[PDB]
Design a protein around this ligand. Structure first.
Ligand SMILES: Cc1ncc(COP(=O)(O)O)c(C=O)c1O
Ligand SMILES: Cc1ncc(COP(=O)(O)O)c(C=O)c1O
Lengths: 397, 397
């Protein structure tokens, strides 16, 4: 038997949680686990701009014939404008090529396979903590993953001194991964000035920067959230950007992402991009059309784009109000520990500072589900579940 | 500079040809390369069943939240019934687990990654000739690819004796890849007795069968086309099926496929399937929903399924009329070679027998695009383009 010697795989630290949640029969459960946006009703809605775009596609699509390996051309162009700016020199010099991929995960995997097979890259540096699936994606391509320090769990801030020192041994030709904004899971991003410091250090040490952009528009705005990347783009010959539209378009299950390659000149990037397409061909051949067609339609239509931007602002602002309400209700419910750092953190997630033991208590005694690392999805909080949630947390403090 | 010394990849023998066709400006160009279905009009249509299912989805979808790693459950259930039949013992014994994948290609890569990372398998056997991308997929997962004989070019038939003497070099624990029906590119499939011979030889030699099922329904029928797979399934304890809905549903660019895992018992397949989900998680996380939702909606609704089964029947029969028309028209245009063997070949493709130089001549001089191996897409032939097509072929004989 070929399958007899197989060892079972552990449950995913995030998706295994959602399986335990679907089984729990207790009334009043609260899901603060997976990173999806809930509305004030506690539901995960389809955006109006997306429904409008899907109607246009239903009426106007005449064929489902294969896309090119790199996907919808307009999708790649609108992606580069979103990341680098409408009039970026990167775009005018034709230094960037973008492949449409199945979600942000697929973009990271395409980059990993491309690097492992066509470059001397052997090592990727990832923040500690980070998205748990980062290590698995790069390991799947045979790349060693090291960790650099990031979070000051005492002051609930960026430990910039430890970050610099821990990256001292990152060699020229190593890949260093940066969260573009809304760091997962800490919600603490570098300031513009810290970005500029990292950009200078990156060029001096010869790192290959890889930016993971899964939450553009959830911190401050579409343009502001990209300031760090554009500070790097102004100084580097080469970099890679894995972006995702799962969160900011609410297109999670349609798998809409992009992997953007940047090189010194158009001739080099075209040569490298041909090898990236070869790695896509051997993986999934060509990308799924529906989700990317939606995004390209919205971003190309000025009227639909204005709808989406307002819907994104509504999502970002509801999350910020839930942060404030979360802190206030914890006080009202009698918490003596100070949770005001929550209001400083950006995006969907925040390191609550709860121990694995307290997270386990919340899940089994109170039906409140969070990731074992203490990460809670603030976007899962509503005016209706806020008080029971806070009463449960205060109970385990 | 990390990208400066990368070597450009060669063009894909199929998709590179498609790019040349799009760029060609002559109005009379004929595309017989990529495996997509054309109607008598010369367009690549969307099936009516698909359009109706998409309209249902547009009006009833309330969320785009992530699917499970293995995708839509009903999709997996309906896939297993198509492959093994309604009352299969594999299904009742719970020996089979299916993961929804991005296309058939994605199913192949998932299986390859799963095998290379969790088993001792190191060698995959693929027919000569075969789909060109088979080698790329398995090599990229780190598996060695060996070739066994299949096609008798002299008699334009299956060389069942060479096939066997070749596969005797295949050891136990090796993976042997079989086209379930409509062999690509030859269109010559084993008979039911030859399948049963290979099945017995397979269990006797200890091979792990891997079936590529991209054209179920294009040879004889949905059930008839699965006879070979069901002969293997009745004897083996383990096998893998990579299937695609790109062709038989015309959902090429939505990437709808499945990877079905079979083990000796329910406990072993679940253990093995857990590692397959891990390989998926580190690739694209979870599969695209739109295409698989369409498939599951059509197969779950009796009215829609009846429409789809008739649309698939019309596709299969139009291709059969073009095979007849193609052979007769060649005689009328002055071909002295005998092309009767084309009538005995199944599916969309036919091994024309033209040389690489003749194929090159057809493209450059006559604007007729075929794969360099001489494979032509019969489904690209229409009554309108038949006469110019055959006139060009006769002119290079
Ligand atoms: C930092 C980061 N990268 C990538 C992803 C995955 O994105 P996607 O669901 O589009 O594959 C996520 C969220 O799941 C994330 O937080
Ligand atoms: C034999 C065979 N296997 C797999 C595939 C992959 O199909 P898909 O487009 O679903 O990836 C194809 C054609 O594309 C094929 O002909």
């Amino acid at each position: 038997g070929t399958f007899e010697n197989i060892t079972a795989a552990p449950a995913d630290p995030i998706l295994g949680l959602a399986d335990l949640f679907r089984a729990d029969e207790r009334p009043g459960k609260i899901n603060l686990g997976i990173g999806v946006y809930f509305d004030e009703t506690g539901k995960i809605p389809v955006l109006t701009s997306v429904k409008k775009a899907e109607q246009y596609l239903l009426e106007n699509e005449t064929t489902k014939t294969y896309l090119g390996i790199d996907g919808i051309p307009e999708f790649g162009r609108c992606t580069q404008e979103l990341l680098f700016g409408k009039g970026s020199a990167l775009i005018n010099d034709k230094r960037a090529r973008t492949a449409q991929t199945p979600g942000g995960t697929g973009a990271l995997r395409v980059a990993a396979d491309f690097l492992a097979k066509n470059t001397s890259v052997k090592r990727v540096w990832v923040s500690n903590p980070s998205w748990p699936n980062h290590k698995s994606v790069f390991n799947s391509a045979g790349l060693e993953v090291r960790e650099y320090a990031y979070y000051d769990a005492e002051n609930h801030t960026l430990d910039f001194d430890a970050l610099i020192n821990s990256l001292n041994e990152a060699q020229a030709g190593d890949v260093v991964l940066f969260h573009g904004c809304c760091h997962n899971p800490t919600g603490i991003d570098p300031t513009l000035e810290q970005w500029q410091t990292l950009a200078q250090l990156s060029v001096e040490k010869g790192w290959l920067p890889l930016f993971d952009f899964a939450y553009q528009g959830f911190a401050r705005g579409l343009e502001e959230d990209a300031e760090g990347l554009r500070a790097f783009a102004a100084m580097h010959k080469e970099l890679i950007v894995a972006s995702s539209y799962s969160k900011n378009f609410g297109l999670y299950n349609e798998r809409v992402g992009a992997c953007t390659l940047v090189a010194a000149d158009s001739e080099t990037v075209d040569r490298a991009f041909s090898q990236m397409k070869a790695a896509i061909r051997a993986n999934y051949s060509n990308p799924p059309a529906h989700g990317a067609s939606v995004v390209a339609t919205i971003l190309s239509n000025d009227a639909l784009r204005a709808i989406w931007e307002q819907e994104l602002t509504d999502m970002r602002q509801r999350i910020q109000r839930m942060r404030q309400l979360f802190v206030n209700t914890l006080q009202e419910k009698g918490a003596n520990r100070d949770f005001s750092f929550i209001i400083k953190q950006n995006g969907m997630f925040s390191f609550s500072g709860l121990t694995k033991e307290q997270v386990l208590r919340l899940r089994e005694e109170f039906g409140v589900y969070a990731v074992a690392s203490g990460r809670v999805n603030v976007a899962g909080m509503t005016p209706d579940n806020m008080a029971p949630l806070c009463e449960a947390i205060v109970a385990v403090l």
